[PDB]
Amino acid sequence: QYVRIKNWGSGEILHDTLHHKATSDFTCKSKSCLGSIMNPKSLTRGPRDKPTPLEELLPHAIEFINQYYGSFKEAKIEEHLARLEAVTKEIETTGTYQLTLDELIFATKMAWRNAPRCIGRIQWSNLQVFDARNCSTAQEMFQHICRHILYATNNGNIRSAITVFPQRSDGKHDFRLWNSQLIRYAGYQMPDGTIRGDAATLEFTQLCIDLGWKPRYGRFDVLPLVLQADGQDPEVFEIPPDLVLEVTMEHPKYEWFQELGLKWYALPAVANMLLEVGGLEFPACPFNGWYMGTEIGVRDFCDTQRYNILEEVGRRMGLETHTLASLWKDRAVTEINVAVLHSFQKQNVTIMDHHTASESFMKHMQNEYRARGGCPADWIWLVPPVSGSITPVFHQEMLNYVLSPFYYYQIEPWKTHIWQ
Amino acid sequence: QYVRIKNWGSGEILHDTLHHKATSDFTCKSKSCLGSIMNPKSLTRGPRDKPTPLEELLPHAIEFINQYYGSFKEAKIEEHLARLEAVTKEIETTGTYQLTLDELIFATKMAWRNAPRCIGRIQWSNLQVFDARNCSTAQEMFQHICRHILYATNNGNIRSAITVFPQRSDGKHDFRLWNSQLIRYAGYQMPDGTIRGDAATLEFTQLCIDLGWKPRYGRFDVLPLVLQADGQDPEVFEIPPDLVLEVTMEHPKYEWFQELGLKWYALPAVANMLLEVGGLEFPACPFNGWYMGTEIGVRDFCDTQRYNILEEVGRRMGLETHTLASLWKDRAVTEINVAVLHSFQKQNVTIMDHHTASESFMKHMQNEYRARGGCPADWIWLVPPVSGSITPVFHQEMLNYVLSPFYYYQIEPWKTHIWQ
Ligand code: HEM
Ligand code: HEM
Ligand SMILES: C[C@H](O)[C@H](O)[C@H]1CNc2nc(N)[nH]c(=O)c2N1
Ligand SMILES: C[C@H](O)[C@H](O)[C@H]1CNc2nc(N)[nH]c(=O)c2N1
Ligand SMILES: [Zn+2]
């Protein structure tokens, strides 16, 4: 029938009918909840040896073409019927099929729409699609990615975009970006026991250096693009510095803040995800939106396993840093966040604070239920890393499910790559 | 086999074998996660008409006696064997069985140990058990509850305790406390459109007044105990004011804070939950621990649906209250929290800040996995309503499951009570 969902802040009740269209088995079990797991098999789509079995491809394909044509106000039935026949003809002829640019565009926005862990989804229809399905060399990959970065940045006025490379064919000719993010800082373990830069990119920076990247041993060293084209080994490309736009941090009160020598790139671009749509799969399709302050201020800067700056931001604020109960950490993190938002605001670079983000998502969630009867949502990811219950999303009960199209995680490439 | 769990902050990995001992079907489905739902059927144990089917009672009973005797270092096998026989003899003779005080004590601590939504579980073995299984009248219920409140309070030096009333027999002679909490404030809808006190207790305060309670139309009016004994209708009892200990709020810097006229009761006591153990069920068994600042500071005070004080605490702090992006809400909530912790600390009343709480739970979680191979945990409840990722629990992946004994929710009594 339907599932009842309540918003404990507003008292409003909603009915979820959309979960009925969910793929196959998800994260949890009959006797336990595992929604707390970061990378479950259910959110991951791995490698392939042989092409996709046609008995599987065709129904998926037909369902996608049905969804696409079922999406315009006053559909084109003769076009719909023609497309179904052509797709079937193509599947039986070539072993697979090609999406029209229009279908791809629709696929990319819908997969974003279906991303349960994204707060920015109110923006789902504003997405620029770069068709790089004709690509064949790593060098061409690199050029496409540069156009992306250039377009996306727009000199601070961030624009959301995605660039789709060739779809998986047999499974041994996959196009992959070995980077987690398009733009990201390096993390080196220093001689003195410490770690500089991004502790999260440790194992990867080591891979980059092993493929011959020149380690600039600093704290904000933008790592290189590590591209895998067709079946080939990955090639290393340096990101043109002119393309990488950053924001240096500074507080509108605490003038000693900038003396911390902190900054962050203005571009949040997921590089290693896979787009599934109508039986097809694209293992290389980097995408970007704009940042939400907490990503940088709370997670990037304050996480133990990342930059870890809390200890000294507390010190430099006076604060009893050795008395947990004093709530210094609460004090600092709040200031590190106004810095980020001020620094981004001042330097004319798009940013979104978590409160306005949460409020926009709530508006989106209502639009979604009204428009299609549901919105797949992952509360654990959707609730900001700070000020939990101060945001509307905390009081909203939600359902998490995998629809199609969708953006999946992939098993990291170095673990499955057959080098030549 | 076992489930792999990772702590993304420390890199530590853990194996969960305990989830194999989980009861029956939990919250989620084959195709979707619903761990975000507040009151799912899986966390609730409802009404009964007829006694418990013996085919069900006996295995459950035997399993509990096996667990109990399997719990002491160097067990008493002849006592274990004797207890199994006696329990079986009693079940076949009287239709049910009675727990020894020692087994009850063990049951109450283990059910607490198994509460996936409790952060304070490191304390699980320090629990005072009040045996009120001999009780028969509402007046005796009221006396027991008063002894509880008195003992628990200890004049600020809060002590954890539970008071167990008679177990469900046929299902139509249930002992129930109609209150959500032992001590709790009233919420009235005022003439001027507003609402005073606790907006959460609206529908209930109306029930109290309908059973003849005298509405003192204030903002901190401690509601009456509404007791249901044997099968009978509920009787209303006023909580002796001398028993109710409160804490008035005041900031160690902002002297205008106390002029807000704010306070909160020093006793967090869940009144409406059901204890299940070895086939048996106790529908009345109120329990208490001590408070965690955020409960009062963030949830009680700042929630829209509760006291809702943010708007004016912001105003009285200067803050641009009409500019979301200014992060005023972050600023205020932090101060409302130091107040609570200071006010509680000054007035010599036990309290625990969320950071130290999170750290103690993490230590408990490790002790648990080491001791029994798991710890049922609900990330959505365990992560504080503020400073999410600043706490260790946010980075800890966890598994949520229902073991036995356990504390269940119950369908609210007014919805199922056959009045006489
Ligand atoms: C327009 C601005 C957007 C904002 C403000 C936004 C914000 C966010 C935030 C805050 C996260 C969590 C990041 C993390 O904790 O790792 C996220 C994740 C995500 N976003 Fe959005 N997003 C936007 C646009 C997009 C776009 C354009 C796409 C795809 C076309 C997208 C796809 C996703 C996906 C798949 C995730 C999950 C990533 C993962 O699982 O690691 N987002 N987004
Ligand atoms: C010793 C101090 C303790 C602390 C600091 C503590 C703290 C907490 C906190 C912060 C919550 C969440 C409250 C909410 O958000 O509604 C909670 C819930 C809970 N606690 Fe503990 N607790 C303690 C002792 C106990 C005891 C003694 C029991 C039982 C014998 C217990 C049983 C539970 C249960 C069942 C819940 C879930 C309540 C619900 O689902 O509404 N706690 N505790
Ligand atoms: C273990 C836990 O799942 C993990 O720390 C989470 C929680 N919620 C999150 N939320 C977001 N948006 N991003 C994250 O990285 C995480 N990680
Ligand atoms: C909808 C959502 O489940 C709800 O707001 C939650 C989340 N986590 C919580 N955590 C605690 N400890 N207490 C709560 O009341 C809640 N409620
Ligand atoms: Zn689940």
SSE layout and pairing:
The structure is a homodimer.
Chain A: E1 3-6, E2 13-16, H1 54-69, H2 77-94, H3 101-113, E3 128-131, H4 138-153, E4 161-164, E5 176-177, E6 187-188, E7 196-197, H5 202-210, E8 225-228, E9 235-237, E10 246-248, E11 263-265, E12 269-270, E13 274-277, E14 280-282, E15 287-288, H6 293-302, H7 310-315, H8 328-346, H9 354-372, H10 379-382, E16 406-408
Parallel strand pairs in A: 3-4
Antiparallel strand pairs in A: 1-2, 4-15, 5-8, 6-7, 8-9, 10-11, 12-15, 13-14, 13-16
Helix pairs in contact in A: 1-2, 6-8
Bound molecules: protoporphyrin IX containing FE (2 copies), 5,6,7,8-tetrahydrobiopterin (2 copies) and zinc ion.
Notes on the structure:
Two copies of one chain form a homodimer. With 420 residues, chain A is of the alpha+beta class. Chain A folds into three domains: 16-133 and 160-170 and 274-288 and 358-382, Alpha-Beta Complex (Nitric Oxide Synthase, Chain A, domain 1); 134-159 and 174-245 and 409-413, Nitric Oxide Synthase,Heme Domain, Chain A, domain 2 (Alpha-Beta Complex), CATH 3.90.440.10; 246-268 and 291-356, Bovine Endothelial Nitric Oxide Synthase Heme Domain, Chain: A,domain 3 (Alpha-Beta Complex), CATH 3.90.1230. In chain A, 31% of the residues lie in helices and 12% in strands. Chain A has ten helices and 16 strands. In chain A, the strands form six sheets. The first copy, chain A, has a four-stranded mixed beta sheet, with helices on both faces. The longest helix of chain A has 19 residues, at 328-346. The first copy, chain A, is globular and about 70 Å long. The termini of chain A are far apart. Chains A and B meet through strand 1, helix 6, helix 8 and helix 9 of A and strand 1, helix 6, helix 8 and helix 9 of B. The structure holds protoporphyrin IX containing FE (2 copies), 5,6,7,8-tetrahydrobiopterin (2 copies) and zinc ion. The site of one protoporphyrin IX containing FE has 18 residues of chain A, from loops. Chains A, B: L-arginine binds at residues 181, 290-291, 295. Chains A, B: Heme b binds at residues 118, 409. Chains A, B: Its main location: cytoplasm. Chains A, B: Keywords: Calmodulin-binding, Cytoplasm, FAD, Flavoprotein, FMN, Heme, Iron, Metal-binding, NADP, Oxidoreductase, Phosphoprotein, Ubl conjugation, Zinc. Chains A, B: (6R)-L-erythro-5,6,7,8-tetrahydrobiopterin binds at residues 36, 299, 380-381, 394.
